[PDB]
Design a protein around this ligand. Structure first.
Ligand SMILES: CCCCCCCCCCCCCCCCCC(=O)OC[C@H](COP(=O)([O-])OCC(O)COP(=O)([O-])OC[C@@H](COC(=O)CCCCCCCCCCCCCCCCC)OC(=O)CCCCCCCCCCCCCCCCC)OC(=O)CCCCCCCCCCCCCCCCC
Ligand SMILES: CCCCCCCCCCCCCCCCCC(=O)OC[C@H](COP(=O)([O-])OCC(O)COP(=O)([O-])OC[C@@H](COC(=O)CCCCCCCCCCCCCCCCC)OC(=O)CCCCCCCCCCCCCCCCC)OC(=O)CCCCCCCCCCCCCCCCC
Ligand SMILES: CCCCCCCCCCCCCCCCCC(=O)OC[C@H](COP(=O)([O-])OC[C@H](O)COP(=O)([O-])OC[C@H](COC(=O)CCCCCCCCCCCCCCCCC)OC(=O)CCCCCCCCCCCCCCCCC)OC(=O)CCCCCCCCCCCCCCCCC
Ligand SMILES: CCCCCCCCCCCCCCCCCC(=O)OC[C@H](COP(=O)([O-])OCC[N+](C)(C)C)OC(=O)CCCCCCCCCCCCCCCCC
Ligand SMILES: CCCCCCCCCCCCCCCCCC(=O)OC[C@H](COP(=O)(O)OCCN)OC(=O)CCCCCCCCCCCCCCCCC
Ligand SMILES: CCCCCCCCCCCCCCCCCC(=O)OC[C@H](COP(=O)(O)OCCN)OC(=O)CCCCCCCCCCCCCCCCC
Ligand SMILES: CCCCCCCCCCCCCCCCCC(=O)OC[C@H](COP(=O)(O)OCCN)OC(=O)CCCCCCCCCCCCCCCCC
Ligand SMILES: C=C(C)[C@H]1Cc2c(ccc3c2O[C@H]2COc4cc(OC)c(OC)cc4[C@@H]2C3=O)O1
Ligand SMILES: Nc1ncnc2c1ncn2[C@@H]1O[C@H](COP(=O)(O)O)[C@@H](O)[C@H]1O
Lengths: 50, 52, 320, 459, 27, 63, 120, 347, 19
């Protein structure tokens, strides 16, 4: 690409955002297990959040 | 650090002059062979804190 | 490195190449002694490598493309402006003298490196043992201050002890009348401004200090001008010398190995040329030092290490 | 927070692989994109803070300081690019790298979940700032400031380090989230008194405190413009942020340990404001104004009411923007007259009318003209300190006279009167300089419309 | 007048609250 | 992020950090008791190996 | 502290029981930081010998990154092993001494009296 | 010196350190120290000048007195225990004499009075060997006798070393003496945490060896032995001033550098043991050595200097000196703090 | 107008034996 330097920070954003989602799965020990938002799962659904 | 090379390689570099109860030439006992043997067999494996 | 301690371990000794022809022969004389051909004549009778006399740009001739760098990069000093105004305001006298002494130290390191690495003897012109013969002849003329002489003696004390004196010193007797005659017949308008007391002080520090101290650590051969016209008698005197003075006799492989490790490290040779003594004749300010360094980086072939410059046509740098 | 740290780090290959004429444009563009990205931190809640991971979190205290930090980098790149034009390209990239590294340290200083990671990043911010101030400060004469930095290290950050390791051994954690629920009352004892001084004096020097402000009209003077911008805008506010975190653990001993230092600030803002009436150096005048405004933040944190924390964080954001703009105006005259003397170049409204409009607006925000958030922070701190003691309004209001007095004097001396005759290099305003003044002032004016995003976690 | 008095106060409060300077190793 | 996501992520963070803080205090207490008593696998400073003793009949009987 | 533990089988960098522990992934952020230290080492190596820093010796920078990742992988395995041994000894010591770690009774805040200190 | 003989003598230095590290009998400990001293004496006399002969004589006398005190300690151990195991001692008099003798071998105060002189008289590579490799063997013996070490003696020696290493380097313009007082201060930092946690002692030893090796390798790469010759480095190689900057900032203990790593952990291991005043004043004294480091890099490394014209000759030649492990050691001496829990591999 | 740097007077304070 002739403008390959203008994608260092934006891909560096998205990858960073990617890792944030990657950490959320490591903090899902109380997904649908709190005393405030516990509920039965709707049909065609495996998790309450991702 | 005590890098225990002698036990890792299984060689006897200087364990022999270490105590009086070890194998001496011509089976010569030390004067306190029995006492040192008793104290070594007491303090073996229990650590120095429990040994004191 | 190409040469190092591993080569000394693996068998590269320098007494394996130390023949009778391995002589460091130094030819010395006044400003127009005409010895410039005589040294070359020795280099066509003994089979030795002639080194010309180190000017301002000898370091430029050793590095890069060999071409002389501009005077703001190399030297920052002028011989001809010294000939015009020897008592100048900008301090060109001792700055030129110190640059020439560092050039001679680099040339003498080159001479010992070539001698110890090839076994071929080297003929020099006015080596590091005969540079102060200008300096005191400047200082007897009041061209420089006393602090310049003290700075020069400190630099010489920390640099000349590390080396070996030459095997032979060849001195040429050309008096001040014949020097001035050859100056007027030469045709350089800057060189025709050289005075008589300066040349006489050059000759007095020759005949009274340089040769009476080199007549112990080596063997002097003092010729007049017309008998130095014949190279054959000079070479005949050289080839029948019984070398028995000086520290060349107690040179084993270890001492010459340490000397060869010294002379091949050019920054270690030039280590104490710029000693931390802030003398105004040689002190460059911080902003001018930064400016000339950033301009020397922009010179082609000088930005990186020598095998690492795409502008001059170095290939395969990514695999180096 | 890792969607902000990684673009800030990707500004390093962006600044070292950029073409030589493009390194300001690229870093300014991508740092403005990071500052636009920085608004995703406004996902705050009325009960819970925004808790990203085990390492990073953001309540409504850290979020506006993060947005101001990520906004300050493009402005510093604009402000510092003129006087680095004759600089070496590699040294210019080293300057930009130290700015990027300072932003990198700050944006994970404010989000530090645990307090010793806060300490590491907090004392990590000093090193690129030190190198920026002493390598690009245009003159360095620091014979008295070396001993003062030794005093900062002795009386400040090292007792904080020993105190935080002590809390790590006692409580078992230094997570601020855990310390919200495992906080024990810190009773009256001499051990707890030295504990309070260890937890507070580092942040007291960082604010700065009156009597401890000796570094700040030196370090602001001997610095480049980007260094003065980041000192006034962010690096003072680390002390206030750290006080608002560490005063959770210091209850209830704070309720009688605050009384000396409150006096040191309540009288101190009377003095330093008065000091601004006798300043020959304009940059020193803005420095003593920064001391005179951070004294109120010290008082508002030490009295620990809700209105005082709301006013203190609003005053921190507002004073960051305002004093950064004041240093940029001081530089926009220093780049022309080549001297910081405030009586040298006078009558500049005759020559630069739009720049004098920017001087007028920055002065009116400096003297807390309502409804600006300078006044909102000032006013809420004054209300809370009236609830603390009804006499302090005098020491508030008298300050609010003198704060007006040097604000317009700085306007009247530099911009009004007769122009200086022998100065003829006064160029018209470059579009860069006016853009810098507008990117300071227009966010500061837009925050008057919606101030609720800069009033902290207990709005 | 300053450092000697502050040090003597520190030694007094080390007597009071039990501050150990050559503390015995426990963990 | 949803308030559910932030809320439950906060609860998981708090579980991990409370477990780590309790484990740090237990680590301190375990090291204190093992240094005091010497009956654990830590602070086992060595003594003499009793396999070095010569149990042969010696030159004299009384030993 | 734990020197009586690794004295029965001395001079073992990774013991046999260390193979019961999960090894670090190759995308371990600690190991990625070690590879970044290798890249910094390659850049400093080209800087101190006046080479083009980002250009010269790409094979050399590749061996710097490779060698630091290679050493750091086993260093992280030993690190994880020693913290696992620390927790194993801790838990086995608590289990073998129930008298020293009493289950202290958990009181809710309805019985706990805390002194209220008003901010006024 | 013949390079084969140099290899043999350096292998004998290493062999003496190994014999001290691996042996179970006190006589072999003493033999390893004798071998180490006898082998290191020619490394100091490599250049054959009277300063190296003075330095080697002073080093010989200090290490010989220390070796005789070590053998007297071993002999009193034999009186009161009838055996020879390198373990805890069985008499407080043997404990005091062996702590004194190892303090003389390390150069800790009040026996510090040879370390600035000897390091000044010997070359930079032999000073590197003295300040890094010669610390390994007595720290090993102190690591193995710590059940018998008197706490008051080791803490008195430690804080005396830290104060004297702090207030001795404020006056110094010679780089080798700055490194020597830094050595004395770091040995105080290693031995004060010895009876609390010896793993942090090993951590401080390894981080110190890395930073000291970085500093002496930069000194050999620039051929600078004084402050003022170090100031003339930016006009020759600008990166070397950056590296001595970051490494001297690391040796004083700045965060977030790696040399902040040990001593912070040391404070972290001294407040567990309820010692608050001692690591406090200990790091107060470390602020003084950090403070003259910041004078010695602010006043005389950052802001660029008057140079000399002969330096413009030295622009035309690159460094052919073998800068062995210098980028690796410079990265490790600065950027290692994010890997601070690596210390568990030293347990 | 430019940046200050050490002169000879500043530099000679670090050239003696002791500081
Ligand atoms: C990276 C960080 C370390 C880099 C060190 C070398 C940098 C360098 O050489 O820069 C020049 C080089 C460009 O220069 P060039 O054109 O090639 O030639 C240089 C000229 O010859 C230079 O011209 P010159 O020498 O003729 O004259 C200018 C003069 C100018 O000199 C001066 O003006 C003197 C100095 C001024 C004052 C000091 C300024 C600040 C420098 C120190 C840093 C302090 C802050 C650090 C943090 C606090 C700790 C103190 O000197 C220089 O500029 C020297 C060049 C080097 C400058 C930069 C040196 C950085 C080293 C220090 C930072 C890192 C170590 C400490 C970190 C601590 C903890 C964070 O820039 C880079 O290489 C930067 C990196 C760009 C690419 C990034 C790609 C990232 C890829 C990521 C993925 C790969 C890894 C994957 C891992 C996982 C795998 C599985
Ligand atoms: C385990 C501990 C290992 C510690 C380091 C061991 C090696 C260094 C010590 C001995 C030494 O000086 O060797 C020369 C040394 C070069 O040192 P140097 O002169 O300072 O390098 C400057 C230039 O690279 C000089 O460049 P050149 O023009 O002469 O040629 C390039 C050269 C040419 O390379 C070769 O010729 C190598 C291939 C042939 C090898 C021999 C085959 C027989 O390539 C390199 O030097 C590339 C860099 C090598 C890596 C250096 C650092 C190694 C890792 C150190 C440990 C890091 C731990 C981080 C921990 C972080 C967490 C706490 O190493 C090598 O030449 C080969 C290194 C092989 C590393 C193996 C790692 C796995 C070990 C299991
Ligand atoms: C989110 C959307 C929001 C939309 C609404 C906008 C909200 C506020 C935005 C910012 C407002 C100020 C903008 C202009 C000032 C800065 C530039 C300047 O000096 O230009 C002079 C220049 C006119 O002068 P010139 O003759 O051409 O050349 C200059 C002269 O040589 C020399 O100059 P000069 O001496 O002849 O004249 C200077 C004069 C000097 O006049 C003064 O100094 C008098 C001002 C103080 C006393 C009067 C106001 C007291 C407070 C009451 C009013 C506020 C509350 C009202 C609400 C109801 C009651 C509570 O200043 C003015 O006339 C400025 C008028 C506005 C002043 C606002 C208050 C500033 C005082 C300090 C802070 C006070 C508290 C905070 C106020 C916050 C308001 C929201 O203006 C322009 O060329 C306009 C440029 C474009 C302006 C765009 C504004 C919006 C920017 C935001 C962008 C993002 C959102 C998108 C919205 C876009 C809308 C188009
Ligand atoms: C800022 C000025 C004060 C700084 C003092 C030094 C840092 C202290 C950090 C907090 C340590 C702590 O837990 O203190 C309580 C501890 C209390 O000891 P303790 O916590 O181990 O005792 C057990 C608990 N009680 C009190 C219930 C028995 O204080 C000390 O041990 C001494 C504190 C003063 C330190 C004196 C040396 C430095 C003097 C000032 C230098 C600046
Ligand atoms: C200088 C730079 C510019 C200024 C920056 C600030 C520097 C000074 C910082 C500290 C300010 C003063 C100390 C804080 C005062 C808080 C109240 C207090 O201590 O009152 C004085 C005290 C009254 O006694 P009392 O408080 O009851 O003591 C028992 C405590 N359980 O009286 C006494 O007990 C008698 C005196 C004892 C000595 C106290 C020494 C420690 C405090 C200073 C450190
Ligand atoms: C670079 C790493 C190179 C490692 C090579 C192999 C080293 C090795 O296996 O050492 C064994 C040693 C564990 O043996 P142990 O007797 O338990 O050690 C007691 C130390 N006080 O293990 C260790 O000492 C591991 C830690 C070595 C770290 C060396 C570099 C820092
Ligand atoms: C628990 C403990 C177990 C054991 C752990 C391991 C401990 C490691 C301690 C390392 C001590 C290294 C001492 C120095 C190296 C030994 C040999 C030597 O001196 O080599 C230098 C050599 C001398 O050559 P020469 O010709 O005399 O130089 C004069 C200049 N014309 O050549 C030169 O002068 C060339 C210039 C560069 C030399 C750099 C040498 C760096 C060596 C240190 C590497 C870092 C330490 C290892 C990693 C950490 C280990 C703790
Ligand atoms: C001469 C030496 C050894 C040191 C001391 C010193 C410098 C360089 C720069 C400065 C300095 O003194 C400090 C004093 O106090 C602060 C406090 C600061 O923050 C707390 C702060 O932040 C940038 C800056 C400053 C001074 C500052 O600019 O080198
Ligand atoms: N102080 C000095 N005065 C004049 N010439 C000098 C001085 N120092 C060195 N030289 C050199 O000596 C040369 C004279 O030798 P020649 O080659 O015989 O002309 C001059 O051309 C200079 O290059």
């Amino acid at each position: 690409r002739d403008h390959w330097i203008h994608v260092l920070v934006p891909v560096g954003f998205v990858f960073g955002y990617y890792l944030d989602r990657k950490n959320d799965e490591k903090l899902a020990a109380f997904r649908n297990k709190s005393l405030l938002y516990k509920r039965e799962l709707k049909p065609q659904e495996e998790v309450t959040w991702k | 650090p005590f890098f225990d090379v002698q036990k890792k390689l299984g060689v006897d570099l200087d364990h022999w002059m270490t105590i009086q109860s070890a194998e001496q030439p011509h089976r010569i006992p030390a004067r306190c062979h029995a006492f040192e043997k008793e104290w070594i067999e007491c303090a073996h494996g229990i650590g120095s804190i429990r040994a004191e | 490195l190409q040469y190092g301690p591993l080569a000394y371990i693996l068998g590269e000794k320098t007494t394996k190449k130390m023949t009778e022809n391995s002589k460091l022969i130094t030819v010395d004389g006044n400003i127009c002694s005409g010895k410039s051909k005589l040294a070359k004549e020795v280099a066509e009778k003994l089979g030795l490598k002639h080194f010309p006399e180190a000017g301002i740009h000898y370091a430029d001739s050793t590095t890069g493309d060999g071409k002389p760098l501009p005077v703001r990069f190399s030297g920052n000093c002028s011989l001809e402006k010294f000939y015009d105004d020897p008592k100048s305001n900008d301090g060109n006298s001792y700055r030129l003298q110190a640059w020439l002494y560092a050039s001679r130290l680099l040339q003498y390191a080159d001479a010992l490196e070539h001698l110890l690495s090839t076994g071929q003897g080297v003929v020099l012109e006015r080596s590091i043992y005969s540079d102060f013969v200008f300096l005191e002849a400047m200082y007897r003329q009041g061209f420089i201050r006393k602090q310049c002489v003290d700075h020069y003696n400190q630099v010489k004390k920390v640099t000349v002890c590390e080396y070996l004196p030459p095997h032979v010193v060849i001195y040429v007797d050309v008096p001040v009348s014949e020097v001035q005659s050859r100056i007027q017949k030469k045709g350089n308008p800057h060189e025709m401004k050289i005075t008589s007391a300066y040349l006489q002080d050059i000759e007095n520090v020759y005949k009274g200090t340089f040769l009476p101290e080199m007549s112990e650590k080596c063997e002097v051969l003092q010729y007049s001008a017309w008998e130095a016209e014949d190279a054959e008698k000079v070479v005949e005197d050289i080839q029948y010398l019984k070398y028995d003075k000086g520290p060349w006799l107690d040179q084993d492989d270890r001492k010459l190995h340490n000397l060869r490790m010294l002379v091949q490290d050019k920054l270690e040779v030039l280590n104490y040329t710029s000693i931390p003594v802030f003398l105004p004749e040689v002190t460059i300010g911080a902003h001018q030092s930064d400016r000339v360094f950033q301009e020397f980086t922009e010179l082609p072939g000088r930005k990186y290490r020598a095998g690492y410059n795409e502008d001059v046509g170095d290939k395969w740098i990514w695999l180096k | 927070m890792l969607k902000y740290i990684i673009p800030t780090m990707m500004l390093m290959p962006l600044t070292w692989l950029s073409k030589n004429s493009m390194i300001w444009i690229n870093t300014t563009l991508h740092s403005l994109l990071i500052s636009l990205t920085s608004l995703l931190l406004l996902n705050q809640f009325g009960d819970n803070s925004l808790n990203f991971s085990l390492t990073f979190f953001s309540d409504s205290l850290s979020t506006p300081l993060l947005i101001l930090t990520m906004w300050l980098l493009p402005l510093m790149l604009m402000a510092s690019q003129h006087h680095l034009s004759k600089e070496n390209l590699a040294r210019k990239k080293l300057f930009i790298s130290m700015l990027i590294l300072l932003q990198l340290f700050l944006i994970m200083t404010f989000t530090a979940t645990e307090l010793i990671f806060f300490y590491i990043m907090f004392e990590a911010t000093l090193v690129p700032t030190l190198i920026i101030i002493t390598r690009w400060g245009n003159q360095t004469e620091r014979l008295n400031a070396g001993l003062y930095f030794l005093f900062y290290t002795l009386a400040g950050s090292l007792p904080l380090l020993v105190a935080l390791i002590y809390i790590q051994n006692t409580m078992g954690s230094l997570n601020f989230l855990i310390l919200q629920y495992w906080v024990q009352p810190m009773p009256n004892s001499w051990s707890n008194t030295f504990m309070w001084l260890a937890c507070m004096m580092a942040f007291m020097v960082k604010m700065p405190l009156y009597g401890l402000h000796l570094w700040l009209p030196k370090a602001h003077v001997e610095a480049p413009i980007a260094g003065s911008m980041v000192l006034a805008a962010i690096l003072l506010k680390l002390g206030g942020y750290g006080m608002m975190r560490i005063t959770l653990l210091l209850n209830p001993i704070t309720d009688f340990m605050a009384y000396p230092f409150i006096m040191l600030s309540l009288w101190g803002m009377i003095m330093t404001s008065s000091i601004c009436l006798r300043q020959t150096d304009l940059k020193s005048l803005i420095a003593y104004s920064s001391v005179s405004h951070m004294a109120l933040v010290i008082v508002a944190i030490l009295i620990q009411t809700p209105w005082s924390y709301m006013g203190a964080t609003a005053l921190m954001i507002a004073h960051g923007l305002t004093s950064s703009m004041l240093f940029c105006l001081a530089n926009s005259n220093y780049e022309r007259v080549h001297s910081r003397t405030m009586i040298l170049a006078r009558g500049l409204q005759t020559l630069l009318p739009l720049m004098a409009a920017w001087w007028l607006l920055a002065s009116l925000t400096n003297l807390a003209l309502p409804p600006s958030i300078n006044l909102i922070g000032e006013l809420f701190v004054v209300m809370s300190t009236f609830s603390w003691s009804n006499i302090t309004i005098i020491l508030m209001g008298l300050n609010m006279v003198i704060t007006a007095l040097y604000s317009l004097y700085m306007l009247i001396t530099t911009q009004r009167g007769k122009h200086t005759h022998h100065i003829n290099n006064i160029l018209p305003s470059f579009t860069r300089e006016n853009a810098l003044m507008s990117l300071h002032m227009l966010p500061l004016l837009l925050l008057s419309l919606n101030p609720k995003i800069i009033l902290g976690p207990l709005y | 007048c300053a450092y000697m008095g502050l040090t003597a106060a520190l030694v007094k409060m080390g007597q009071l609250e039990g501050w150990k300077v050559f503390a015995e190793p426990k963990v | 992020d949803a308030p559910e996501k932030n809320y439950e992520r906060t609860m998981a963070i708090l579980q991990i950090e409370s477990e780590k803080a309790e484990l740090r205090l237990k680590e301190l207490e375990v090291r204190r008791l093992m240094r005091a008593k010497g009956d654990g696998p830590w602070f086992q400073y060595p003594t003499i190996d009793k396999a070095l003793i010569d149990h042969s009949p010696k030159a004299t009987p009384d030993n | 502290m734990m020197t009586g533990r690794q004295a029965r089988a001395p001079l073992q960098f990774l013991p046999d029981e260390a193979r019961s522990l999960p090894p670090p992934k190759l995308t371990d952020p600690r190991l990625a930081y070690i590879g970044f230290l290798g890249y910094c080492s390659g850049l400093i190596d080209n800087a101190i010998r006046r080479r083009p820093v980002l250009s010269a010796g790409l094979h050399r920078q590749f061996l710097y990154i490779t060698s630091f990742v290679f050493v750091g992988y086993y260093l992280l395995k030993r690190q994880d092993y020693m913290y696992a041994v620390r927790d194993h000894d801790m838990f086995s010591y608590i289990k073998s001494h129930p008298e020293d770690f009493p289950e202290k009774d958990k009181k809710t805040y309805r019985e706990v009296f805390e002194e209220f200190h008003p901010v006024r | 010196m013949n390079p084969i003989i140099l290899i043999i003598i350096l292998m004998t230095v290493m062999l003496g350190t190994i014999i001290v590290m691996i042996s179970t009998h006190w006589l072999l400990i003493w033999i390893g120290f004798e071998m180490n001293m006898l082998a290191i004496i020619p490394i100091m006399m490599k250049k054959h000048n009277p300063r190296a002969t003075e330095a080697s004589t002073k080093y010989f006398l200090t290490q010989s007195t220390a070796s005789m005190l070590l053998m007297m300690a071993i002999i009193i151990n034999l009186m009161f225990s009838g055996q020879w195991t390198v373990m805890k001692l069985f008499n407080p008099m043997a404990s005091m004499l062996m702590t004194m003798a190892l303090a003389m071998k390390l150069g800790m105060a009040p026996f510090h009075f040879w370390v600035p002189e000897v390091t000044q008289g010997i070359p930079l590579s032999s000073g590197l060997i003295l300040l890094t490799w010669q610390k390994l063997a007595p720290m090993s013996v102190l690591y193995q006798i710590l059940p018998s070490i008197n706490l008051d003696l080791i803490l008195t020696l430690s804080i005396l070393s830290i104060t004297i290493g702090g207030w001795g380097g404020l006056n110094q313009t010679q780089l080798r003496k700055i490194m020597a007082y830094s050595s004395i201060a770091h040995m105080g930092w290693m031995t004060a945490v010895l009876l609390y946690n010896p793993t942090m002692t090993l951590l401080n030893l390894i981080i110190y060896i890395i930073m000291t090796s970085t500093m002496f390798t930069l000194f050999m790469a620039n051929s600078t032995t004084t402050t003022l010759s170090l100031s003339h480095t930016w006009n020759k190689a600008p990166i070397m001033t950056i590296l001595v900057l970051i490494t001297l900032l690391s040796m004083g203990g700045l965060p977030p550098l790696s040399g902040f790593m040990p001593k912070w952990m040391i404070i972290q291991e001294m407040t567990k043991n309820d010692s608050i005043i001692l690591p406090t004043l200990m790091a107060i004294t470390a602020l003084l050595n950090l403070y003259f480091y910041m004078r010695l890099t602010y006043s005389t490394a950052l802001t660029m200097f008057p140079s000399t014209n002969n330096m413009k000759m030295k622009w035309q030649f690159p460094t052919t000196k073998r800068m062995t492990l210098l980028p690796t050691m410079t990265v490790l001496s600065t950027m290692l703090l994010p890997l601070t829990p690596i210390l568990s591999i030293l347990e | 107008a430019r940046q200050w740097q050490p002169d000879v007077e500043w530099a000679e304070q670090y050239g003696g034996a002791v500081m």
